[PDB]
Enzyme design. Structure first.
Site, PDB file in Angstrom:
ATOM      1  N   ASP A 199      31.264  43.283  38.873  1.00  0.00           N
ATOM      2  CA  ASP A 199      31.249  44.787  39.284  1.00  0.00           C
ATOM      3  C   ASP A 199      32.428  45.543  38.534  1.00  0.00           C
ATOM      4  O   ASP A 199      33.258  45.006  37.843  1.00  0.00           O
ATOM      5  CB  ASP A 199      31.036  45.035  40.773  1.00  0.00           C
ATOM      6  CG  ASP A 199      32.360  44.872  41.421  1.00  0.00           C
ATOM      7  OD1 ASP A 199      32.736  45.410  42.371  1.00  0.00           O
ATOM      8  OD2 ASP A 199      33.077  43.693  41.324  1.00  0.00           O
ATOM      9  N   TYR A 202      36.207  47.529  37.763  1.00  0.00           N
ATOM     10  CA  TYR A 202      37.556  47.299  38.204  1.00  0.00           C
ATOM     11  C   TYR A 202      37.544  48.418  39.457  1.00  0.00           C
ATOM     12  O   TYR A 202      37.009  49.466  39.427  1.00  0.00           O
ATOM     13  CB  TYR A 202      38.608  47.576  37.209  1.00  0.00           C
ATOM     14  CG  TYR A 202      38.881  46.806  36.118  1.00  0.00           C
ATOM     15  CD1 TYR A 202      39.266  45.267  36.666  1.00  0.00           C
ATOM     16  CD2 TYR A 202      38.592  46.996  34.657  1.00  0.00           C
ATOM     17  CE1 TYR A 202      39.556  44.383  35.427  1.00  0.00           C
ATOM     18  CE2 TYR A 202      38.669  46.015  33.742  1.00  0.00           C
ATOM     19  CZ  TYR A 202      39.280  44.811  34.111  1.00  0.00           C
ATOM     20  OH  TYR A 202      39.577  44.020  32.973  1.00  0.00           O
ATOM     21  N   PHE A 246      35.250  44.742  31.871  1.00  0.00           N
ATOM     22  CA  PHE A 246      36.531  44.148  31.581  1.00  0.00           C
ATOM     23  C   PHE A 246      37.558  45.145  30.626  1.00  0.00           C
ATOM     24  O   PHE A 246      38.600  44.583  30.706  1.00  0.00           O
ATOM     25  CB  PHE A 246      36.678  42.611  30.875  1.00  0.00           C
ATOM     26  CG  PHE A 246      35.828  41.807  31.885  1.00  0.00           C
ATOM     27  CD1 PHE A 246      34.431  41.363  31.784  1.00  0.00           C
ATOM     28  CD2 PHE A 246      36.549  41.433  32.994  1.00  0.00           C
ATOM     29  CE1 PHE A 246      33.770  40.428  32.667  1.00  0.00           C
ATOM     30  CE2 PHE A 246      35.531  40.478  34.071  1.00  0.00           C
ATOM     31  CZ  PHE A 246      34.193  40.276  33.839  1.00  0.00           C
ATOM     32  N   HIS A 268      34.161  33.143  36.594  1.00  0.00           N
ATOM     33  CA  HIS A 268      34.646  34.530  36.434  1.00  0.00           C
ATOM     34  C   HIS A 268      36.164  34.280  35.827  1.00  0.00           C
ATOM     35  O   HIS A 268      37.010  33.602  36.535  1.00  0.00           O
ATOM     36  CB  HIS A 268      34.524  35.445  37.714  1.00  0.00           C
ATOM     37  CG  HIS A 268      34.810  36.716  37.471  1.00  0.00           C
ATOM     38  ND1 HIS A 268      36.157  37.534  37.437  1.00  0.00           N
ATOM     39  CD2 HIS A 268      33.898  37.930  37.297  1.00  0.00           C
ATOM     40  CE1 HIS A 268      36.020  39.060  37.262  1.00  0.00           C
ATOM     41  NE2 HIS A 268      34.649  39.035  37.185  1.00  0.00           N
ATOM     42  N   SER A 273      39.487  32.676  40.320  1.00  0.00           N
ATOM     43  CA  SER A 273      38.250  31.686  39.695  1.00  0.00           C
ATOM     44  C   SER A 273      38.414  31.275  38.495  1.00  0.00           C
ATOM     45  O   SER A 273      37.818  30.107  38.034  1.00  0.00           O
ATOM     46  CB  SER A 273      37.114  32.441  40.024  1.00  0.00           C
ATOM     47  OG  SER A 273      37.226  33.645  39.091  1.00  0.00           O
ATOM     48  N   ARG A 321      38.302  27.564  37.517  1.00  0.00           N
ATOM     49  CA  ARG A 321      36.846  26.622  37.619  1.00  0.00           C
ATOM     50  C   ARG A 321      36.148  26.730  36.418  1.00  0.00           C
ATOM     51  O   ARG A 321      34.864  26.444  36.719  1.00  0.00           O
ATOM     52  CB  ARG A 321      36.333  27.582  38.707  1.00  0.00           C
ATOM     53  CG  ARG A 321      37.050  27.427  40.281  1.00  0.00           C
ATOM     54  CD  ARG A 321      35.962  27.980  41.245  1.00  0.00           C
ATOM     55  NE  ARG A 321      36.066  27.479  42.749  1.00  0.00           N
ATOM     56  CZ  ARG A 321      35.646  26.557  43.295  1.00  0.00           C
ATOM     57  NH1 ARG A 321      34.526  25.854  42.614  1.00  0.00           N
ATOM     58  NH2 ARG A 321      36.089  26.062  44.324  1.00  0.00           N
TER      59      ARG A 321
END
Length: 223
Positions: free
Chosen positions: A64, A66, A77, A187, A192, A195
């Site tokens: 979604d 910022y 982004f 993400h 995250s 990961r």
DNA sequence: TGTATCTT
DNA sequence: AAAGATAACA
């Protein structure tokens, strides 16, 4: 000249009269009466104004927009000057520096240069209530961005889809995995990134997959 | 205090 | 659904 780029308005107009879209826009309008919603109205569809729909070669899908002041401007982004790159983008830049030999931090966060080359910078959800991540999820945006992904899937061949995060990954079922290249990872948010994002090498992999299909690679440094 | 993902 | 648990630190 308006919010939707001409070629995108032409192919996505069938969604405008559908009940979910009418209700979604009504919800967004109501949210704007009580809260600060990002990005401003004129920037919700900036992802449609950078290149023609038929010139899209790569699709980067985030979660979604910022949710902080002066940040979101309709390209996933990205942040316009003089706003500094937020944490998610600093992580994208770090991965790009290790992945692409020529890449160095550009000194800004405006990703218009990628979008102009045919990189669709989309989010699964296109609006967000201030300071609250994913607050506008499951309100109808996913059905609209499913329509965008499905159009690209049905009417093109050999696109590269970069699905970043769990929410973006839900669009994997709308893409024919044998006709397009779908790359999935965590993400880039600090919460995250470890990961899978760091070391995913999505940028070099995208260019190699484009060059194999006879298409011109993305100049990730063209910012 | 702030920038996802899995579990209950 | 929503909240708790969790890994990572400028």
């Amino acid at each position: 000249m308006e919010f939707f780029g001409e070629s995108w308005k032409k192919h996505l107009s069938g969604e405008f009269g559908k009940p979910y879209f009418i209700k979604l826009m009504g919800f967004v309008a109501e949210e704007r009466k009580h809260y600060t919603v990002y990005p401003p109205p004129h920037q919700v569809f900036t992802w449609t104004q950078m290149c023609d729909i038929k010139d899209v070669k790569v699709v980067i899908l985030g979660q979604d927009p910022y949710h902080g002041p002066n940040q979101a401007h309709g390209l996933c982004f990205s942040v316009q000057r003089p706003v500094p790159p937020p944490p998610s983008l600093e992580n994208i830049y770090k991965e790009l520096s290790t992945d692409i030999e020529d890449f160095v931090h550009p000194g800004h966060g405006d990703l218009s240069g990628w979008a102009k080359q045919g990189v669709l910078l989309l989010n699964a959800v296109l609006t967000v209530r201030a300071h609250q991540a994913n607050s506008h999820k499951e309100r109808g945006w996913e059905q609209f961005t499913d329509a965008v992904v499905s159009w690209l899937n049905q009417n093109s061949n050999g696109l590269v889809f970069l699905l970043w995060g769990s929410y973006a990954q839900k669009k994997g079922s709308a893409i024919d995995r044998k006709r397009h290249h779908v790359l999935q990872t965590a993400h880039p948010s600090p919460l995250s990134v470890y990961r899978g994002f760091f070391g995913c090498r999505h940028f070099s992999k995208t260019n190699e997959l484009l060059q194999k299909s006879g298409k011109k690679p993305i100049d990730w440094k063209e910012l």
